[PDB]
Amino acid sequence: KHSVLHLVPVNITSKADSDVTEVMWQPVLRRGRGLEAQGDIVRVWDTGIYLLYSQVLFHDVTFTMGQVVSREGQGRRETLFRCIRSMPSDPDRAYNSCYSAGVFHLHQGDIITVKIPRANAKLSLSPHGTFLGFVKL
Template sequence: MAKMSLTREDIKPNTLQKAQSSLKILSRRVKREQGSCKVPTSFLQLTTNTNKQPDIRGNLTVIPWTVSAQQGNAISLKENRIVVQEDGFYLVFGQVLFNSPSTVMGHIIRSWAFNKTWTTSTELLRCLQEMPDETPANTCYTGGIVQLHQGDELELVIPYSQQTLISMDAESTFFGVIQLN
């Protein structure tokens, strides 16, 4: 049996050149357009302020927050609310670790919009979690993409839960926003 392999000399020069040029084209690195892989312009993550107790306002519990991570100028903290400085789309997220036996616990993330003549509150995200009776500890996490406008304020509140026990640990209870555009 004859060996059926070709050497470089056996291949027609024209065919070899075509193959080499195809390999060069395939192996070329494509330069990405600038900005095609950009990081978020701004983000803000809040954790519980362990020096303060949660604030009870009527039928709402408001967790005291402190800044744990921040970048950029599009988002800031003002009086326990996240304030949006630039219009755009944002990833909003929040988690609370509840330590109370009850049927259902949860929190709401809402947006406040202000104008000279009116103020509106809009519920953006809601998290509900059934609490086990035998070991009353369960997290409730929610997150979503929302369109926000300059001047909007975000807050995380716990409704109808004046006897709620909340974990004030930074890794268990947090609230934040990431600018997407």
């Protein structure tokens, strides 16, 4: 039976002097045992092929917004996918969701990160606006 993990936001972090915003995740659906949310990252415990999907809902007039999903393991970082959305300059118009997904080989011990490469990014913490999930194939 396929392992699944669907995550929604519980908080947001953007360190001072950084140009990055990250989401703290909490599980809302889990079957099987090969992945574990650890705050702003997800730990891979079982090597395999996974479907990874990520949506972020932005309410931000910054010229482009989006997210970068990466895997880090064995001293290396690999970008799996990026989603990019141009935003309007008027705040009442500046709402856009950004969805992307794909199938990737992940190794035991890897860390998956979802980063918005802007400081203090204005994203929704709504569980139906911003979310992250995994299906082991």
